[PDB]
Structure 1
Amino acid sequence: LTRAVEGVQYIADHLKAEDTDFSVKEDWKYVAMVIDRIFLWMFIIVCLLGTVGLFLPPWLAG
């Protein structure tokens, strides 16, 4: 019947729209992940460099 086909079409369209929105949300999650990774690299570099260039002299004196 017309009601059945209309309902099935609406359900399919609703699922498609939800999928599209979920895709954009996953994109935002991936962007946050990338920002976190780049700052992980930077902070590891800074931490090691500082801990080797500011606690090296204490061994030189002691």
Structure 2
Amino acid sequence: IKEAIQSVKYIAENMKAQNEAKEIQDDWKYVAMVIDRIFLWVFTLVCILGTAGLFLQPLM
């Protein structure tokens, strides 16, 4: 009788813990996306600077 209500409490607590773990995994994915974007911009600038300063400018 009381066991069913305690089981519903257990299900609710399990789903809350699973939600918090999914939040932590989303944070780990978002920090990887941030590192990906900053190195995208850095290597885009380095590639454009290299193809400008080393390939066209002396060879003209």
TM range (shorter): over 0.9
Task: Kindly report the root-mean-square deviation, in angstroms, between the aligned alpha carbons of the 2 structures.
Answer: 0.6
Name the count of aligned residue pairs.
59
Instruction: Look up the match of 1:41.
Output: 41
Deviation digits for residues 21-47 of structure 1 (CA, Å, limit 9, x no counterpart):
000010010000000000000000000
Aligned equivalents of 2:2 and 2:11: distance in 1? 14
Give the 4+ runs in structure 1 shifted more than 3 A: none
Q: Shift of residue 12 of structure 1?
A: 0.2
Q: Secondary structure of 1:55's match?
A: helix
Q: TM-score, normalised by structure 2?
A: 0.94
Q: Residues 1-60 of structure 1, C-alpha deviation per residue, up to 9 Å, x if partnerless?
A: 2111011000000000000000001001000000000000000000000001010122x1
Structure-1-length-normalised TM-score: 0.91
Identity %: 56
Gaps of 5+ in 1: none
